[PDB]
Ligand binder design. Structure first.
Ligand SMILES: [K+]
Length: 207
């Protein structure tokens, strides 16, 4: 699959793409306002994620730190990023179908649209001012709005036993972004696309 990742924010983001134990394509890159990065993701990739990182510093060897979404201090991410991170998630070519979603399960940092550029399905978006409205206990100094599992580490918020319900904190995310996952056992907002679709991930889509 081809993913075009576009930064429509007025600020620089450092995009990242990983499946948890390996980079996808180059794994990360700086995107100034308006810049686009096209990556190729191998067919059959399960559990891929794309996210933005904010307020990064990197030296000439690609080592440093970001205030949101840092993946162990690397420009080119091999692992997933530290919350809070709005997540574009996908599994490709699973029995002839692609599955995509946006997730707020690891919090929110940057607004995002995740849309197919090929026919046969619809896109999803979370573009509300979650950071501005974020409850005080979830607000991350670095920027962003953490999920309640990250902050409080309870079995209920983290759904440790595979049994959990919605919470005041999950309902906050869901009210502002109904098409994104707000907790582990949320009614799925997963979209099913034809296998081998192509996609566009746009940061700050209403900017
Ligand atoms: K936006």
């Amino acid at each position: 699959a081809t993913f075009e990742i576009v930064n429509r924010c007025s600020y620089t983001v450092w995009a990242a793409a990983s499946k948890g134990d390996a980079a996808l394509d180059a794994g990360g890159r700086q995107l100034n306002s308006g810049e686009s990065w096209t990556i190729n993701v191998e067919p059959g990739t399960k559990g891929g994620k794309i996210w933005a990182r904010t307020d990064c510093y990197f030296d000439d060897s690609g080592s440093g730190i970001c205030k949101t979404g840092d993946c162990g201090g690397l420009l080119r991410c091999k692992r997933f990023g530290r919350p809070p991170t709005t997540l574009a998630e996908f599994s490709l070519n699973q029995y002839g179908k692609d599955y995509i979603d946006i997730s707020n399960i690891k919090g929110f940092n940057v607004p995002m649209d995740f849309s197919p550029t090929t026919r046969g399905c619809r896109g999803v978006r979370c573009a509300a001012d979650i950071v501005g409205q974020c409850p005080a206990k979830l607000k991350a100094p670095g920027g962003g709005c953490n999920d309640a599992c990250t902050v409080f580490q309870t079995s209920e918020y983290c759904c440790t036993t595979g049994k959990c319900g919605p919470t005041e904190y999950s309902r906050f995310f869901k009210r502002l972004c109904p098409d994104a996952f707000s907790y582990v056992l949320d009614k799925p907002t997963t979209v099913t696309c034809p296998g081998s679709s192509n996609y566009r991930v746009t940061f700050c889509p209403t900017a």
